[PDB]
Symmetry: C2
């Protein structure tokens, strides 16, 4: 990172608590996780926190971080790090509206979007709550019109297809949440998500819809995002093309089929959308933290207002828990500190999100943005080069598919991979014995990762079956041995209700906040996506049939030239 | 890994070529990638290989591995490692049928499934080709009956829904390939994939289908996989439940709606499926290498026989290329050596699969199994503990969604992430200018990762706009700086045809082979999934309402107890 050419940050590495954690790593890092359970019979309880979601169904968010290389000394020391880095003060600063996003000088108030208490939160001396509530009401009114069949298309047909056009922050949330809350959805409304600028994405959606009965939701923060605008222009062209082919008058069609979710009012007006059909969100709403805002319109159209309010309330309950609960019983802080322990001391650069809920299959992809785009920084707020590892690579697939895909590596690979196992006690689908069979894997995999299977256990088991062959035993022994001591966090909820999902995302948003603040980075900007955009914009006019270039490096030149030789 | 309790492997670390590569890393590892381009104006060509797919459309698989910290000395040295570890001999051994899967004493012949030359390949002194071709013909006959509408359901309805029931190796391939080859599919046949034992997966598919017009394909190697059998039992129960509710005679219904893809003949017969409806595959066909076999039936039903043969031929062309092409011009070997260079010398434990093709959106998940389940081993074939890092964590999303998700981390994170950018020159969907806009990002992102943007370039650019503020420049400078020197491989094809997909998967299968052989591990077994299965089987009878347990660690105990307290 000497190529960044800024001086190295010492504020974190010079912390008394950081030096202590390094000492505790050298001392207790080689101690297997099972040792902590053998020495403390109450570890499961002492290293777990249950947070009630405040609902009638007695739903909760239970974090069990016991399956970790963390003893009482390390835990106390991680909490000391949180105190020395001023997390409590930073949390208050984020929540009260301060310009914590220092590089862009913007507040970070995604918590305001779900502020059900309607406690005044000020930006420029003005309470943002009436504006947040105004959009939520506008979203309610509009979503009800789409859901009841009141909102008609140009030919008078009720909406049957809801196509969200947006990428990243204006896609992953809408996709993840509608997928996660499908049993709470209105089934007669087919949700489609056009995000990729690959023509295929719009083309396949156009093949799956009855355009006359389709509401296109153009979602984009700046409303300038090349992907979203190109797709939206093609979606508009498609609408106009259909009506022209049928000989129908196209006047006023766009206003009935197109709505916008943006911060930018003028680019929405330039596109041809009515102002009353523009759902406002603000600059203090980060894209990867926007599913709670206007961006959440396709979620609200799918699940309804009441369920969207539950989604917000779950987030609010965790926001209140995060800001008010004591350090040792604070779920997102503990989740963050467990992460810092593994990333910075163990050197674990990856983190697996393994949701044992098929509805949560798009959660790892969502968390990839939430974590990686937030914390994949190498410079602090002060402009200094980080002297520690920052954001990890997030990956994962909904279990149990991951088991038959990459658990082999988590169990027997050369990499230590901290895992987050998320599961529901009650399924929304009461299908035979599926849920108990499903959940047997949930508890087993974490147990497996922790306890492992020593050579002695393997030898015994083989001697237990009909194995008389010392050759077969000796040969199979190391292959069947599981070192164990592989960490995992278990997130257990009563059921995946909209409130529960809200609670889970907020927890991760807040985990990311703490980790970012410990590292001293700006978890809310994204300067890293700019070079790719600028270089793409420079390559775009060069992608013409037979055009030859030489202004780039020989690889990019040869690639563009080859493309141009065989493109059209 | 002292907990494996086997002696450390020295066969790889003692290699003259390994010691040399470590020396070359210490010497040239800090040299930025751009330096290699500045010193060699022909780097783009010299560090790239075009492999023709032998088709009329002049399709190819082009690997550009130039954007790497590899100079001529390092390349020569990586090829020397390949020669010292006996890769050429190992490849011949794999291809000719030898028991290279040493821990299970099984051949590894997924190459036989796509052996279009029909060159005799022997297992137990018997040519496997007539058996491979017999199943391919049986698959052809059956798939044509489903496609033409000849295969009827119990009520006489033509098949409209094809539901594949299988997990991992019996899922990811079928999902990835049908998604990848959707423009070559028969649209009136809706493909569904039930994999998760989460009741939700079967339940949602049951809501999306007309059971009378549904063919259920039970795919499982051993036909004992708990997930696949539980789902298949529920799919059968669902069929029988429908007919009983309509008062229809259920006799002979299962035989018309259910088919099996297995190696196990008796478990298929015990389930209630006719023998003529059992599509055979063998023990030498690894699950994660099975999409080419009987497991590929849902792919064949979707795209047709001719297109499935093209899929096989693409794989065959790369199989021939891999086994016969010279080391310096061998695509999977080079791809593998670039990987070994990054994993073992740079310490890069992650690898991003970034396919710039929306149809290839399930490719990273497929490659997660192919790579991670194959190479996520810590013990060699000889039973010794590995002394090097093995399989990396594979992740990725189809671009351009990844750009707005985690590229921020790849560009500005504290982790070096080797990336595989895969793209097509020609789209199957000619939608406006979408493909050129799309591909501008494809070439740009790799260029971006490589060249970066130095502080001088950032200062100049800001001075170029209307920036007079030295404070704003100085503050934004490190945040806007891109260190560059981030590696990438560019895989460019003319178009994503079935042949092209076959070529891509085979290349990765062979990359995994070389990497596994260099490390000395068994890339074809999966002993790491067994503990989770055994512990799940032990937890299953304990998951009853109100049941309390104490035989596990306090975490697993508390989790099972909490589940049982609030489950039913």
């Amino acid at each position: 990172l000497k190529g960044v050419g800024a001086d190295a940050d010492t504020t974190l590495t010079s912390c008394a608590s950081w030096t202590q954690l390094q000492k505790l790593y050298e001392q207790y890092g080689d101690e297997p996780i099972k040792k902590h359970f053998e020495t403390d019979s109450e570890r499961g309880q002492r290293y777990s926190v249950k947070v009630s979601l405040g609902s009638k169904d007695e739903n909760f968010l239970f974090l069990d971080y016991s399956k970790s290389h963390i003893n009482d000394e390390i835990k106390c020391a991680l909490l000391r790090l949180a105190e020395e880095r001023g997390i409590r003060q930073f949390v208050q600063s984020v929540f009260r509206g301060e310009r914590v996003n220092t590089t862009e000088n913007r507040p970070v108030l995604h918590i305001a979007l779900r502020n059900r208490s309607n406690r005044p939160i000020y930006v420029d001396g003005k309470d943002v709550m009436p504006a947040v509530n105004k959009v939520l009401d506008q979203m309610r009114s509009f979503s009800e019109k789409v859901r009841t069949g009141e909102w008609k298309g140009h030919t008078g047909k009720a909406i049957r297809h809801v196509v969200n056009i947006g990428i990243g922050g204006s896609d992953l949330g809408p996709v993840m949440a509608t997928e996660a809350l499908k049993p709470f959805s209105q089934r007669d409304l087919s949700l489609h998500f056009v995000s990729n600028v690959d023509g295929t994405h719009i083309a396949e959606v156009l093949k799956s819809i009855d355009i006359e009965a389709t509401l296109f939701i153009v979602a984009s923060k700046t409303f300038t995002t090349q992907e979203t605008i190109t797709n939206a222009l093609s979606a508009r062209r498609a609408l106009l093309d259909y009506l022209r082919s049928r000989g129908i008058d196209e006047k006023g069609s766009v206003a009935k089929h197109f709505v916008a979710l943006s911060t930018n009012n003028q680019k929405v007006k330039e596109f041809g959308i009515d102002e009353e059909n523009m759902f406002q969100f603000w600059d203090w709403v980060g894209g990867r933290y926007s599913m709670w805002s206007a961006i959440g319109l396709p979620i609200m159209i799918s699940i309804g207002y009441e369920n969207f309010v539950e989604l917000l309330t779950g987030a609010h309950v965790i926001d209140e828990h995060f800001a008010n609960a004591p350090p040792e019983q604070n779920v997102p802080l503990l989740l963050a500190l467990v992460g810092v322990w593994y990333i910075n001391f163990f050197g674990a650069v990856t983190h697996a999100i393994l949701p044992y809920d098929q509805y949560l299959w798009r959660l790892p992809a969502y968390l990839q943005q939430l974590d990686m785009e937030s914390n994949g920084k190498y410079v602090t707020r002060s402009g200094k080069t980080v002297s520690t590892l920052t954001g990890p690579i997030i990956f994962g697939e909904a279990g149990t598919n991951g088991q038959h895909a990459f658990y082999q590596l988590i169990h027997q690979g050369t990499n230590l991979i901290p895992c987050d196992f998320i599961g529901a006690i009650q399924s929304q689908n009461k299908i035979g014995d599926h849920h108990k069979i499903f959940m047997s894997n949930f508890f087993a995999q974490t147990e497996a990762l922790m306890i492992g299977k020593s050579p002695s256990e393997v030898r015994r088991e083989l001697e237990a079956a009909g194995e008389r062959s010392a050759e077969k035993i000796n040969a199979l022994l190391p292959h069947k041995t599981f070192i164990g001591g592989r960490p995992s966090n278990t997130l257990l909820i009563k059921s995946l209700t909209p409130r529960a999902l809200g609670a889970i995302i907020a927890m991760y948003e807040h985990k990311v906040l703490v980790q970012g603040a410990i590292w001293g980075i700006d978890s809310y900007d994204q300067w890293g996506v700019e070079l790719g955009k600028v270089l793409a914009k420079s390559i775009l006019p060069q992608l013409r049939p037979g055009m030859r270039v030489n202004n780039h490096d020989s690889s990019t030149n040869g690639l563009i030239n080859m493309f141009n030789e065989l493109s059209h």
